[PDB]
Amino acid sequence: LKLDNMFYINSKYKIDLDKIMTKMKNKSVINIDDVDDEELLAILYTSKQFEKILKNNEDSKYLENKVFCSVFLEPSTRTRCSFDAAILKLGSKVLNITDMNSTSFYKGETVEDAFKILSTYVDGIIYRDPSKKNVDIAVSSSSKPIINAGNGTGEHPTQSLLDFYTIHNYFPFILDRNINKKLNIAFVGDLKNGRTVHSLSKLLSRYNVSFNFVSCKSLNIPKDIVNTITYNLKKNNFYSDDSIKYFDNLEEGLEDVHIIYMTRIQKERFTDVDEYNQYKNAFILSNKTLENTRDDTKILHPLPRVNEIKVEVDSNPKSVYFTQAENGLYVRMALLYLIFSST
Amino acid sequence: KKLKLDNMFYINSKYKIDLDKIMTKMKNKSVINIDDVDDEELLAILYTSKQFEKILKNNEDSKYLENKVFCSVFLEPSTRTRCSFDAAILKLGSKVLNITDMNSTSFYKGETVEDAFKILSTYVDGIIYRDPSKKNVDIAVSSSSKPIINAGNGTGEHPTQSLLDFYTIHNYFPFILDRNINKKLNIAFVGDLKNGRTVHSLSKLLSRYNVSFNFVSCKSLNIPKDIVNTITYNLKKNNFYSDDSIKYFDNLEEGLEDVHIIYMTRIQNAFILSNKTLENTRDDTKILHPLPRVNEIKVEVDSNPKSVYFTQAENGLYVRMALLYLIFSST
Amino acid sequence: KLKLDNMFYINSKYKIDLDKIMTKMKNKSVINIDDVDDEELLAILYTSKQFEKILKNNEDSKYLENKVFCSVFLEPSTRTRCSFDAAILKLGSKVLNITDGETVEDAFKILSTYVDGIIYRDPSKKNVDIAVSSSSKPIINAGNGTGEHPTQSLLDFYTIHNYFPFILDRNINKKLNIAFVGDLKNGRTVHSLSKLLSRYNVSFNFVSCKSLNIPKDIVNTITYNLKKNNFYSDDSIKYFDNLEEGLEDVHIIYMTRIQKERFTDVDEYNQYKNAFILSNKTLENTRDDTKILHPLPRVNEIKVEVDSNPKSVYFTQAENGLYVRMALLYLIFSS
Questions:
Q1: What is the dihedral sign for C-alpha A326, A329, A334, A339?
Q2: Rg (CA), chain A
Q3: How far apart are CA C113 and CA C241, in angstroms?
Q4: In what order do the strands lie in the sheet with C202-207?
Q5: Active site residue B197
Q6: What residues in C contact A107, CB-CB < 8 Å?
Q7: Which other chains touch chain C, taking contact as 3+ CB pairs less than 8 Å apart?
Q8: Vertex B204: Cα angle to B263 and B264 (nearest 5)
Q9: Is B81 annotated as catalytic?
Q10: Rounded CA gap, B117 and A215, in Å?
């Protein structure tokens, strides 16, 4: 697999793919901190390759004869199906456990033992669970690599990877760490519960980025995350009093941002009905709301959406969430290729 | 790589067609209603299915559609159609991703059909979709950037069922295709003619040929008017309509007379088929049933050589392999 | 065409033609462990060992390509279900999965026209036997209501033979001693493994609470099989209350699960749940060569510390299910 695509050859951070693969072989990806600077760039270049290969109907079968287990103990479309598609288009095979309760899969069996056994039959495991902590038990027990597909309200590392790829596409300076080229993002909605928000904000804070956090009170971004953002921006001297701002309305939170990152208000997590109805309707993105964005503003959403983005916005050239979803195929193909390829 | 129909020369001279070019033109078609299939597409479907049936039976290589990936979305529970389609995919040498219910999916959280299909389309080359909704399938088709085959919906279209039904009938009575005023097929549909979509849709398909229909039911479970009209219409279009064309009965002994085909329906009991009931039918008579059958056909009948309902079910495989090959193969 | 290491050594040692045995296995359904005869067992065991060697050298395992299997599990399973599927994928074949008011007969009659074979788990006694007579294709029983689960007994035996190959020789001088421990009344893998082991020169220690004693029917079949090969003595079967006597001079300790579902209420369960707990302390008495098996899953009956003990092989045992299921699919379905 040779990187010939028009991003890698123009890029100014050339890379040794062989060296990075060695380093990447058999790595678990649990949190976005498990992927460093060079790994990221390798993912991104390799992701463009696979995009190019697929867009040009060329042979995508660069990882043959692996068998993966896909374990989804909570509902998923994009994430589960796109992993599987990536697995199959690469020439490898997948076993699926898709069981809708953590309870009735650990049926008096410890997680430790389940992952001990299960890892013997496969080269790798993809693992979504509504528990934050189970993936950690799994990583220590497993003899094979785990890719976390979302652990409760913790993280979604491969979401953040495909999100970044999509951002980089429109705003390639995000990688340069150039103090005169700041990206501005607005994260809107369920900041407390959104594992995608969590992973993407920690990832972006390693680059030259300022953050608008647009939420109603009970879904404010967790303090531990702003401390992580704050620490990371300080590390590269991109921190100022303007780096992080909090808003409770759209009009203000959307000003001068390159990226609008919309999110779903997670009904499943609310107890007060009235509080849900109120929060549900707070931030609704519409062409009217977009009139005052920058012209180059791009709209992401990890999906699925309920009412938070009106369908009219799909026709606005600012909306890219369907492309974003598409990219998951390419990014997940790249991640798997890098980790699981033979020596 | 490229599927060759045996005896292409004879089939092109008999029907007055070019089967190679019909087949080429089916690339990327979606098949949602039986009316999506014209006269020439049906021949191609039928002969491409025979070919796969020849192949599999002489243990030959059937891998004519390698390296495709399909998503199979089944939001009803099913057994035979779901399995049948996955077997067809796998025997063609392609791969399949399965959804077998709403709850394991982002539908659970309220995602729309439009969104879910816009996205699924980008991961795969095509989609097989079953959904007890009336209109989700049509939404899926405008949302989808890839061809879809409808595996069964709430408007009662189930077109691969009516294609395999047709293929079974044609097997034993090939003259069905010929539209020859001297060779009329007669068929008795029997049972829940009111609810059986499978009857409605095969009715609609058969009525494009020289056929006549005996409908056998209670007054309660009569055949719908809309469907008679379409039968009547379609028969008049090739001059096969006469006052004989559509008889109506309320017992087997009368209904089963002089039919080539008996098509039993699931009731969803004056109509229970037995060896005795069958003594007075024609000798060439074949009995179909889309399946499953509770007790509308007694197990004794399975032994009778007039029974072909298990062969009918087996034919779903060849028909679905044919349809996947025709819609999705490269050039 | 799979080649077996030492094929000809083995033929002259057991007075068999392996090739002819392997060939004759084409289209055999495997429902009950009594459907596997002496020669079929040898064939499965050495065929499993070849797939073990082949997978451990990252060699080509694709000895059964272009078959399509249906997998029908009408009760929850993960270890058994996945293992079969992995076995299939790694042989280069494909599977359709059912994980979940038509007759069984009709369902299997149709289903077997689409597929080359079928793997079926059903807690009904009846359905699997119905399926076998209705199906046009071979079936592998993955577990049914009659306590039959033959690939579990095959993998259990394969595991024991790995450490004590003499188990196959029927050498009056080389006897294997096994302790089965825990719920002997309900532990259906014990019943089945007991019957199979009793065809060879083996001694049995049954270690249980009174009410969970081995059933007299199993003792009987054991006694019968042992007497048939002239391996039976009043010492062939011993009964124990406790583990320290229990575990003396056994090559194998086979721990069973204590199944909460099989007791009236949680109070009765609790009577038995902790009665036998294997620790490193309880393992001090055992022979140096003692290996510990457990069909899994476990709860408290083997303390986690025992996993690090080199005597524990229950995880290698679970892993062996892959090599055995591969072997069995190979022998039944290949040309």
A1: positive
A2: 20
A3: 52
A4: C237-240, C202-207, C176-181, C252-255, C291-293
A5: no
A6: 76, 297
A7: A, B
A8: 10
A9: yes
A10: 30
What does the radius of gyration of chain C's CA atoms come to, in whole angstroms? Answer: 20
Identify the CATH number of the domain defined by range A1-171+321-343. Answer: 3.40.50.1370
Cα–Cα dist B126/C10, whole Å: 52
Do the beta carbons of residue B262 and residue B276 sit within 8 Å?
Answer: no
Residues of B in Cβ contact (< 8 Å) with A92: none
Q: What are the tokens at C54?
A: 């082949």
How far is Cα B315 from Cα B171, in angstroms, rounded to an integer? 10
Q: Quick check: A320 and A294 in contact, CB under 8 A?
A: no
Tell me the chain B residues in contact with residue A88 when contact means C-beta distances shorter than 8 Å. 69, 95, 97
As a whole number of angstroms, the distance between CA B17 and CA B13 comes to: 7
Fold (topology level) of C1-164+314-335: Rossmann fold (3.40.50)
Q: Which residue in B130, B200, B260, B289 is the catalytic one? A: B130
The CATH architecture that domain C165-313 belongs to is 3-Layer(aba) Sandwich (3.40)
C106: nearest CA partner in chain B: B292
Tokens of A237: 């001297």
CB contact under 8 A, A77 and B124: no
Would you state the structure tokens that stand for residue B68, as one six-digit string?
């495709």
What distance in Å separates residue C210's CA from the closest CA in chain B? Answer: 45
**A159, A41 Cβ separation under 8 angstroms:** no
Record the tokens describing residue B110, joined without a space.
Answer: 């309220």
- Report whether B232 contacts B244 (CB < 8 A): no
Of the candidates C314, C332, C323, which has an alpha carbon nearest to the alpha carbon of residue C119? C332
Q: How far apart are CA A163 and CA A301, in angstroms?
A: 9
C89 in contact with chain A, both atoms CB, cutoff 8 A: yes
* CA angle centred on A330, ends A46 and A287, rounded to 5°: 120
Respond yes or no on whether the N-terminal peptide bond of residue A304 is cis (omega within 30° of 0): yes
CA–CA distance, B111 with B101 (Å, rounded to integer): 14
Task: List, by residue number, the catalytic residues of A.
Answer: 78-79, 107, 128, 156
Helical H runs in chain B? Answer: 8-14, 19-25, 39-57, 80-91, 113-123, 136-143, 159-172, 197-206, 225-237, 252-255, 275-278, 309-328
Give the integer Cα–Cα distance in Å for A56 and A199. 32
Q: What is the Cα B327 distance to its own chain's centre?
A: 16
**Cβ B323 vs Cβ B29: under 8 Å:** no
User: Smallest Cα–Cα separation from A28: which of A165, A134, A151, A138?
Assistant: A138
The one catalytic residue in B48, B50, B68, B81 is B81
Q: How far apart are CA A75 and CA C51, in angstroms?
A: 36
Question: C43: buried, middle or exposed (CB in 10 Å: 19+, 13-18, 0-12)?
Answer: buried
In sequence order, the β-bridge partners of residue B131 are B153
C-alpha–C-alpha distance, residues B124 and B136, integer Å: 19
> From CA A274, how far away is CA C22, in angstroms rounded?
70
Q: CB of B76 within 8 Å of any CB in chain C?
A: no
User: Per-domain residue ranges for chain B?
Assistant: 1-173+309-331, 174-308
State the structure-solving technique: X-ray
Domain B1-173+309-331: which CATH number of 3.10.530.10, 1.20.58.220, 3.40.50.1370, 3.40.50.2000: 3.40.50.1370
Task: Give me the CATH topology for the region B174-308.
Answer: Rossmann fold (3.40.50)
